[PDB]
Amino acid sequence: SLPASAAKNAKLATSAAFAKQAEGTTCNVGSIACCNSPAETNNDSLLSGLLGAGLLNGLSGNTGSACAKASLIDQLGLLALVDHTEEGPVCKNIVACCPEGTTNCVAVDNAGAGTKAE
């Protein structure tokens, strides 16, 4: 357990499929996130505050589908919008780009269901 030792990668532990996602979807590395259906992301009343470790916001124009970033995943690991498959840690539903700090996240999918090439 030694952070930032010869590590030139900052992916989702593996990504792979999530990397194909990050290549197929127009987003940014330090603003890469996953957003889930509001009823599930907000399933827990504490979950709503759990995703906002840095006082962040939800989808741009849609207060409900909040997005947790890869850094947030290494901070808490919000399983509300994260799904696990043998391809690695991947999106649960909606893929979008979200800033760490304070502002909404932009969605470049919406109606694609956050699919990834294998």
Distant-in-sequence, close-in-space partners of 96: CB < 8 Å, separation ≥ 6: 27, 33, 34, 35, 59, 65, 67, 105, 106, 107, 108, 109
> Residue 30 corresponds to which tokens in the numbers above?
């330090």
**Discontinuities after residues in the chain (C–N over 2.5 A):** none
HEC profile of the chain = CCCCCCCCCCCCCCCCHHHHHHHHCCCCHHHEEEECCHHHHCCCCCHHHHCCCCCCCCECCECCCCEEEHHHHCCCCCCCCEEEECCEEEECCEEEECCCCCCCEEECCCCCCCCCCC
Could you identify the residue written with the tokens 């499929």? 17
Contact indicator for 38, 3 with CB cutoff of 8 Å: no
Counted domains in the chain: 1
Q: Please give the residue range of the domain that contains residue 49.
A: 1-118
Q: Tell me the technique behind this structure.
A: NMR
Distant-in-sequence, close-in-space partners of 116: CB < 8 Å, separation ≥ 6: 17, 18, 20, 21, 24, 87, 90, 91
Distance (Å, whole) CA 72 – CA 75 = 5
